[PDB]
DNA sequence: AGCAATGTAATCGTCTATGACGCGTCATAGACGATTACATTGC
């Protein structure tokens, strides 16, 4: 591909996640630092200038989501710090971080792990806790006075009360709640009844088999699911539940040589992004199920020489860094040559670098 | 065979101790509740009253930590056989009797006066006469015994009929020996420390009524229910 | 009897005063060996006099360690009932411990807590009871826990130094000096903090099972260790090493498996909370972390999944470690906090029983 | 003494709650306490009714 | 195995609702939240 702007030593803890809504490249990180990287950057300048940081929590941030709508210019940011809470933020423009706690006080009693916003096409979000419950809210902006009303009481099917790792929302009505050991439950929006809940088929021999991520495909029929086989990562698709194969590198069959950490579907469902801890990215055609290309990740690719982080705190050489997340920026979101017609990609490596990429 | 009769108290709408003559603690046999019935009756009446008598068994067994043996009519009488469970023969021998011989020089010692069956019976009168009406004679029967246990027969016989003394001892009887074994170190404080657990008046349920009452339920105290 | 007595004493006030028997309060609290023994011997005697002669209820009163009035009496003077009132066993345990301490004090030879518990198992039951009541007694007389009342912990941590001379003053009042031998896998019996140690790459191992493989292989690293959670004598030994013979050693490191328990053990080794006497800030943390087992799993470890209790412990260990400290980036507890952060989100522990390789060797 | 005072009568003079008597269960306020001379006259009337 | 950690239950203080007395005020008690002890976990 084409290696566009990046930023090394962005944060200092671990930068765990990234999200984007055209204007922004919001990315929570380790030591509770939301550092919104304003997306519309010209010339070649690194995005630090547009880096409008704001201290959030001392505990630590893993996930981050953000929803920009077209009303009024409402745009919220949702983080789920390690201590178990829902930190929301009104992002409005030098942006000001104005915290509106639109939740209640009797609900902050358990640790919510991941969340996903569902746009109105009726804005919703789901944020499952570390007990198993798949909580569902409903947004009501109205005059600034939002109220987030709870409706979801989707209990944990697999026993007992294990780690609800992954979260998703279908375009129409479906919610895939991946668990710590297989059992990616499928539920419905307005009935609160779990539909067909399958398991990872290749579960032979007692070993770790988790669900690192689940992500639906645009129109809402595909159910590509990542998992972890012992010390190897794979990909398993479904239709919204039947097993229809498994992505694998040419050579058991594995997509990567390590854990598949995050996925992403493009605008209309032609490509997949397999973010692996091995140190590279593999792109797959959904219909055909071959790999399109391989994208190596290197620490020296950082444009600023002082921002290169090739040695860890302890003293080894993490030259090939893990990739905690990879996200897609839709048609016309970036600024630059061919930005309107080309889709864009973004990744956050383990060497504390957030790197964007342009379609080519 | 000392005999005590309570003043005749009847509200409507005789303890026998087989001990020598005398500060002394009383204990039950090893005791009977035996009331006669008359209408100034064994026929018909008695047959269900017996069962109503058996209705008290919960209070006798779940509450007071006793154990029944038999309920068999003796002519015109109901036997409510009651053997002690907290203070068995071995326990009485170990506590008050065995250290009663070695340490004769020690004073402040209690004399045992065994308690036998008590029979304070009052024949109530009802307008019906020949036939009998029920479902209010149940509270009528409960009231007398509830009043008798709470008020009089518990401030001077704690060990034989009290509710919150026997339970306290059972809670503290197991650890009663090391305390004496680590204070005067032979055994001598053991025939008295049992006469001090029973000789406190703060443990009576009368005190428990008028206190702050922090723990919400205890001592249901509802006896002789309907069959 | 309340019948015929209620007319003398009226209303709920002062009737509880009448029914409550007067309590002859006895102060266990408020010092050399003779001074310590005098109070203990007087206490038992004056408590026994009330029971034997005056038939007056005793009430053992004392002030325990603050986190303060507390009372244990006989015969449950307490009003109504409190399910907690199954506590005369604790009073008997306290009395028996006082008797045993007073009896074994003049003998002049320290006896272990385990020996005391084994002597009378029926009443003491779990050794935690004896351990807690010993500390209560020590604090109640203002006796310093460092200067033990002739009662010592049973000894835990073993060493594999390839000398380690220990010197001490032995009471009986007299002072005597001794020398204790080492050089093979064994234990250093005891030395007070007033006593000091000498010496003739330290590797801490917390599991003690992986320890007895590295002792066999040995591929001159004096190999001081402990067990799961360190005993008091082990931290005392490490502090004495750093305080008298710090120069000779270099780069001592802990080595714990990457569960929340392992990092908690390393923390309890390295950094303690508000109350601290011996902390051994010397030690460095180079333990086998999450990013030291996954990055080697290509050329193997069983791995595991988080339990509900493990996650709760690791999250609690994140609230504390950084509550007052301003910044994660620069802090003495940066590595532990970031490691626990990774382990919480990776959702997999990494026990160390089979990865044992040349990691222990520095370079 | 052998007066034998009723449980009912005991509460009413002293500190009453009328709620604590529920779990304690001493409450049965139907028979009521009967004074000795009034008891004698009452039982005489009851006996005279029978004829 | 000496020394930890935490979850849970029990107790204690405080707030508020209701009843009683001389429409407002005071007393009482029931319910809620906070604090601590015990043990069931764990190397
Ligand atoms: Mg372990």
Residue numbers in the entry:
A (entry chain C): 5 to 75, 79 to 100, 106 to 133, 138 to 158, 168 to 265, 268 to 278, 286 to 394
B (entry chain B): 2 to 14, 33 to 41, 45 to 52, 57 to 66, 72 to 258
C (entry chain A): 2 to 31, 40 to 76, 85 to 179, 181 to 190, 195 to 222, 228 to 246, 251 to 330, 335 to 398
D (entry chain F): 8 to 58
Task: Give verbatim excerpts from the published study on this entry.
We report cryo-electron microscopy structures at up to 3.3-Å resolution of DNA-bound core complexes of Saccharomyces cerevisiae Spo11 with Rec102, Rec104 and Ski8. Spo11 is a central hub making extensive protein–protein and protein–DNA contacts.
We leveraged the tight binding to DNA ends to determine a cryo-EM structure of core complexes bound to a 23-bp hairpin DNA with a two-nucleotide 5′ overhang. Spo11 binds tightly to the free end of this substrate and with much lower affinity to the hairpin end. Core complexes were purified after expression in insect cells and incubated with Mg2+ and hairpin DNA. The structure of the protein–DNA complexes was solved at 3.7-Å resolution. The hairpin’s overhang end is anchored in a deep cleft between the Spo11 WH and Toprim domains. The remainder of the duplex makes non-sequence-specific contacts primarily with Spo11 and fewer with Rec102 and Rec104 but not with Ski8. Residue Y135 involved in DNA covalent bond formation is on the opposite side of the DNA end from the Mg2+-coordinating E233, D288 and D290 residues.
